[PDB]
């Protein structure tokens, strides 16, 4: 309590002395000479000294007169049922200046590992209302499904549409949406806020906002916070949660930043090296547990470098995350909204989520025949790539009407259009 | 024992003092919680321990204690029909004890049930000189499998007292007079996970394994003790293939290892394996199966250790004289556990971020699988056959994992998604796949069958190769263009692919094909090809042959559905072929 | 006897002993564990009264307090005897085939002495393999570094055993022995080699060292140095014409990487260790001829083809330092000729000293070049078949292509276990070119023979 033995300040780090009972990854708060107060977290503890990182920074600290207090608990998020309708910062602190929230209980944000046998497989699909997602790589409750896109491809716009139109057919209780904004600009953040207010989803949603201005170490916590709140709603309160996290790329950038700040030797391709485990720890907090009502679904939005050479490796996560959804600007150029390249997108859990009793079962057969129509329809128009002098010009025009029609209509249904699955099926029938 | 004290905590690294009696690679319980950890360094009496679980909330001054052993497994009754993780934690018991769907942190549970009562049956008589590996008695663990208690290694001497009866694992069942004195023997022995079990001598695997699946047994067989690597592209039906191999192969026990999977991908395996049915007994496969399963976000060391734990158990049941088959899925995930674990240990990266000892590690694993003479007076033979699923991790063959695996294995079953799109199951590409056991298996096959099986297999493969080249020719020209000889070879190739190569795993009779039945089927196809080629040299035109043979060809297609009692109907096809074809030429 | 109980620290495979005296760089050690297990180790560095050592088998299970380190007082060495021939050893020279004990004449540093530049003599005299393509067209000479480049499965192992059983030297009053080093191969492969050797009586005239694929990497590195030390002994000290064959050298490169990363010195610059090039050069300067001595050392390092696109350092390295090379092709193995030796891509640089009148036949030299051009031209016919598809049949192509194909299945394809002698090869290839017209015959003299 209120130790006053700061012996070093280097960069954003500090060294404290004559402290005992200090655990690793333990939150501290610093009392400066000017009465300012800052939060930091223990990152290394020796026999008597300990070493911490300050979130806000070390500018303005006088070591002789500053003081440190060890809280005695790691990073926590207070959980309450009153979260809905609310906006929080990176560390789950109110950002809308609303009523004070009394936490039901304070939860460690790292979470726990579901026992493999305990986990329950996902068998029921979720109607996105997007023909280019529902029919084919369909999304099931509890699935880990990510959308890959480049900046300015409308990836954020698609994410908004999914949030607005997400629902399930049983609908005994309504859906719940947890949205995390990770290291994104104000303009980007504002887009989502405006959509939710306008559409009224704020009353039905909970969100955590972390902008680029905010410190990198708050980005790490931001995902953990959103998933911990999602788990609280999902399992303790039985809700059905859709978790949407926007640009885990910058979470990964922050991961590298923190690793360099902690003087950790880089891993593969200059990244920390525990990225595989860190991402998998995040992404695997999904699915349904047997014996519990609620469920957790994740649609992480990820900015994708055009090159495969560097950033948060698509296949580093892609095989972690049970399928993926691809957006491309080449697509986007010709009024194709939401630009979903359907060639390389898959939902790993599509087969089981698709059947009579959960879907109208034209759908599995019709999806497979339209999957053949994807391949053959591509053959018909997509594969030409300005070639096909003779190919598709020999009364394959059925083909050479199919796929261009499909690419325009089906992929660009309009960002504010909601297609009931049966309809999507029907427009597939029309295209048949 | 000695209780150490934590002097440093940095990430996953914990350093404890007063730990001189501990050794390198020993397992320790770290902190008040006692999370699992492993010693990697030692300077004077202080040790650098690597913690597998999360180290948050752990600090200095907390006690540390050492198990006095490296990573190890408990081997005895109660081990079958169990769901384990990489470090042999009982998942099933894990739930009931702690009443939680979560894998607790620093939660310690014994692997086996140390307080169930088994009827030990003493098969040995007192005063007998015993060595490491002799069988003193047995316990009927499940309805299928007989669990035999054998002398643990490092024990030599003379039996003093031994009596049958209802015992737990922990209470002693027999006393042995040794040079050091008397050693009591429990029913369970422990073994370090990464130290391979000893054998009298290793010897070649030359006896093929009946997997039932036609393409495997016929063209790319695997020897009892061989190593088969199979890639797992999405939707290729690999799951079905694994199940088929597991329940149909003539092995006594099956060990399935899930190194690090997607969770939902894991739960499918968990639900579908108990529902598999052992054919010869009608019971669940779990009565003779051991399943180890780790999802992706689990402690990394459990994922790396998964393979070694599985093969250690397979080596346990191997020393009993049993034939064991161990399935690993996915080995690619395991290598990922290695790359991350190597990074955590500040190692020097090699190929594409993988450590430099990747090929060495994989070689160590695959060389333990094989056919051996187990220790003991009896000189019994046991074997381990390894099926490893390498996730492509991006469609390529140049992956360090796949190349290094293929450097020490002889069987390759290349699953192709293209064939799955064409409803060709099992979707094994016959051209890309290979087996280096084909020669030895052909010799063994020719002898026991007393036929020229090798000639038949080589002829079928030759026809398939020619089929590839012919239909590539066809794309450029047209199907009419080639000769009746070449076009006939095309249709015989179609016959091989459809009747003999394709197999429906769910059909009652199509799923399993007796070895004699495999022979009769292939002979039917090949006698057809010969008689029609002959009739072409006899001047009959292709189309006339086609009509008279349409009638009998339908019999060939439905012949792959014929029961194993009624094999006389298959040989009869030969007769019908000869009289029909010779009749068509008038 | 000197052994110290003072182990300051252990880190991975590294270990630190203190309060020691008289230790020297690269001494071997043995670690007496508390349970009596023994592990051979080596001294990486020594300073003051402290010594730091690496263990070959690793430090798992070591208890520092209750285990002691015994310093042997000698570097890694090979016990040599005349009676080594006909025996099977592992990578560290220990006997692997039970059998009698061995009282060595002496012990030798396996790294070996450096030849005086003037003393070493040119490679000169001919070695018969029994394989047509090697002997006739791409001759090997005593004291020549000629490697075999092959893909994973195209009977490289069979070709190595091939050469081992058939290789001998003609018209000499001096014995000829073969040293076979297997570097990081699987047990099944190793057993194949040993069984073949025992069956064909080849073992009687050869010494072999066995390093399994799961064996420790430092043993893996040591095997070629050990093999060549025995080779030099028989060749020069006991006056034999040793032939050294090392199976799958590429494995050896891997082992260097593993070790180099463990030591942490020379961190990789191109993915594999810093000085793999110099290391291979060190191994390969051992084959040669000392002027003034009967014996000779030849080596045929075999290693795996790079596969062309997972391109790696090994293809350039040995080739950079080797005196020509020999290539195998998968298509040829699949086609069925055996050994599958594709001649146009491969060659031996030092043909002439070995092939010659008296040593071999006079015809052989001239005949070899003519036959080469005659196949080069079966290539011309194949190239006029490459774009041909089924283009119009001319005269050049029709007869020349047939000659090529016949060569392939009659001279390249000799059969693995068929031992064509040099005279046979020459008469067969002569006959095998004579079907061809006399218009294009480089030697006008002796039209038939």
UniProtKB/Swiss-Prot annotation, chain B:
Function: Involved in ATP-driven sodium extrusion.
Alphabetical GO biological process terms: proton motive force-driven plasma membrane ATP synthesis
Catalytic activity: 4 Na(+)(in) + ATP + H2O = 4 Na(+)(out) + ADP + phosphate + H(+)
Residues bound to ATP: 232-239
Entry GO MF terms: ATP binding; proton-transporting ATP synthase activity, rotational mechanism; proton-transporting ATPase activity, rotational mechanism; sodium-transporting ATPase activity, rotational mechanism
Entry-linked Pfam families: ATP-synt_ab, ATP-synt_ab_N, ATP-synt_ab_Xtn, ATP-synt_VA_C
Gene3D superfamilies: 2.40.30.20, 2.40.50.100, Bovine Mitochondrial F1-atpase, Atp Synthase Beta Chain, Chain D, domain 3, P-loop containing nucleotide triphosphate hydrolases
Assigned GO CC terms: proton-transporting ATP synthase complex
EC assignment: 7.2.2.1
Main EC class the enzyme belongs to: translocase
Organism: Enterococcus hirae (strain ATCC 9790 / DSM 20160 / JCM 8729 / LMG 6399 / NBRC 3181 / NCIMB 6459 / NCDO 1258 / NCTC 12367 / WDCM 00089 / R)
Database matches in HAMAP family: ATP_synth_A_arch (MF_00309)
Record keyword Transport present: yes
Induction: By increasing intracellular Na(+) concentration.
The protein's name: V-type sodium ATPase catalytic subunit A
Signal sequence residues: none
Name of the gene this protein is made from: ntpA
Swiss-Prot record, chain C:
Transmembrane spans: none
GO-annotated biological processes: proton motive force-driven plasma membrane ATP synthesis; sodium ion transport
Family membership: Belongs to the ATPase alpha/beta chains family.
Keywords, sorted A to Z: Ion transport, Sodium, Sodium transport, Transport
Native organism taxonomy: Bacteria, Bacillati, Bacillota, Bacilli, Lactobacillales
Name by which UniProt lists this protein: V-type sodium ATPase subunit B
Any one GO MF annotation of this record: proton-transporting ATP synthase activity, rotational mechanism
Job of this protein: Involved in ATP-driven sodium extrusion.
Signals that turn on the gene: By increasing intracellular Na(+) concentration.
Top-rank lineage group of the source organism: Bacteria
